[PDB]
Ligand binder design. Sequence first.
Ligand SMILES: N[C@@H](CCC(=O)N[C@@H](CSSC[C@H](NC(=O)CC[C@H](N)C(=O)O)C(=O)NCC(=O)O)C(=O)NCC(=O)O)C(=O)O
Ligand SMILES: N[C@@H](CCC(=O)N[C@@H](CSSC[C@H](NC(=O)CC[C@H](N)C(=O)O)C(=O)NCC(=O)O)C(=O)NCC(=O)O)C(=O)O
Lengths: 204, 208
Amino acid sequence: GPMIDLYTAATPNGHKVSIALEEMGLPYTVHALSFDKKEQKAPEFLRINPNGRIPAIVDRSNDDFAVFESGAILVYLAEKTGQLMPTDVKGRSRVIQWLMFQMGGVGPMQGQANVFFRYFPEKLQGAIDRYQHETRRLYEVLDGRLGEAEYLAGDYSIADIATYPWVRIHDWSGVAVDGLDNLQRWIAALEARPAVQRGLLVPR
Amino acid sequence: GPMIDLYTAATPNGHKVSIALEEMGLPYTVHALSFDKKEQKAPEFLRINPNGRIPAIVDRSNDDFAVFESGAILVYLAEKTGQLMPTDVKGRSRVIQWLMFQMGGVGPMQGQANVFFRYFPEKLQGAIDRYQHETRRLYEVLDGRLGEAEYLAGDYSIADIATYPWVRIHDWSGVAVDGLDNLQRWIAALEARPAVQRGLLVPRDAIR
Ligand SMILES: N[C@@H](CCC(=O)N[C@@H](CSSC[C@H](NC(=O)CC[C@H](N)C(=O)O)C(=O)NCC(=O)O)C(=O)NCC(=O)O)C(=O)O
Ligand SMILES: N[C@@H](CCC(=O)N[C@@H](CSSC[C@H](NC(=O)CC[C@H](N)C(=O)O)C(=O)NCC(=O)O)C(=O)NCC(=O)O)C(=O)O
C-alpha cells in the first residue's frame, strides 16, 4: 500500500498535512482518530506521537519512521520529495522562518482564541480579547509580508500550507481579515488550488 | 570580527540562541533591546523581524540575511556549523520534531502560564489552571521521552537547547516537576554544561 500512514482528524493542523500530501502527489493511508473515543491518547498512538495529538505520520518506506508535529511533518515531506521548499540557504530559511511563525504564533494564538471564544466553560472576555487581538496582530504581520511577495517565502511553499488552514477558519475564531488585502489575495489563491480543496476534505 | 548580530533580551527565547552560539563557538555581536523603550517595535528592527520580537539574527557573511523565530535561527545555525543536529534523514527529523514540540507547545503554553499567573491584570484562576496544567502535561511528554533517550533526539541537539530555558523557569511559572525523574536528570545535565551557563548570561530576566 501507500508508503505514508497519516494519523489525523478534521482540524486545521490535520489539514496542513493532507494538503501537502495532495500537492506532492504522494499516496497515503488515512487513520482518522476519534477524539470522542480518546483514540489520540491510546498508548498505541502515543508510540507514534508521545504528545497524543494529531497529525502524525509513519513513513513505511523508512523502516516505519514516525514523524509528529505538523511543522516537522511538512519539513520531512518537503525534503523527501524535493517539493515546496527551495534547496538554497536563503530560500529554505525563509520557508522555515514563516513556518516557525505559524507554529509558534498563528496556530497557538488562534487556537487559544478558539478555546476562550468557543469552548471554555465560562466567557472570560479579557482572555477572548487577548487572543482575538493577538491573532489579528499576527494576521497583520502576514498581510505586510504578502505585500512583499506573492507567497510567504516567495514561491508557494509548506509555509503557506501550514498557515492557510488556520487563516481559513478566522470566522470561527472571531478574527477579521478585513483591511488585509494581501492576505485576502493569498486566501483566494490558496482556495483555488485543487490540492488544497482535496486536502481540506481529509478525513471525511 | 563577529559575523552574527544577535538581537535579544534576557528571556528564555533569547537564551536559546545565546546558548546555541556558545555551544557552537561562533562569535556574535549582542544587541540587547529594551522593551521599556519599545525597541522591538522600532521601524529599523521591524525590517529584521516583522513580528517585532526577539530573538533575531543578521548573518553578515551572506548579505546581511535576517533570520527571525528562535527555532528558525537554531536550524539555520545548526545547518551552517554542522553542529547540534544530525545530517541523516532520521536524525535530522528527530531534532526537528522535538524542536517543533517546543516551538508549538512548551514555549507558547508556558508563556501563557506566565502571562496569567504573573502578568495579566485580571486574575483568572481558570486560565491560570489551564496553562499550568498544560505546561505540566507537556513536561510529562518530555519526561516519557527522556526515559527512552538521554536527550530529546538521542544525542544533545538544538531541540534540548530550545526546551531547557523554558523548563529551567518552571517554578516561576508555577509548574512542578515532581514525579518526572527523567526530566529532572536532563535538567541537571543541561545546567552543568559550561556553554549553557555562558549563554544564560547573555545579554548582560527582562521578561518571561
Ligand atoms: N503543534 C502541534 C499541534 C497539534 C494539535 O493541536 N492537535 C490537535 C488537533 S488540531 S485543532 C486546534 C488545537 N486545539 C485543540 O487541540 C483543543 C484541545 C486541546 N487539548 C486544548 O485544550 O487546547 C490547537 O489549538 N492547537 C494549537 C496549535 O496548533 O498550536 C489535537 O490532536 N488535539 C487533541 C488533544 O489535545 O487531545 C502540531 O502542529 O501538530
Ligand atoms: N516564537 C518566537 C517567540 C519570541 C517571543 O515571544 N519573544 C518575546 C520575548 S521572550 S518572553 C516570553 C514571551 N512572552 C511575551 O513576549 C509577553 C508579551 C507578549 N506580547 C504577550 O502578550 O504575550 C512568550 O510567551 N513567548 C511565547 C513563545 O515563546 O511561544 C518578545 O520579544 N516579546 C516582545 C513583545 O511581545 O513586544 C520565537 O521562538 O522566537
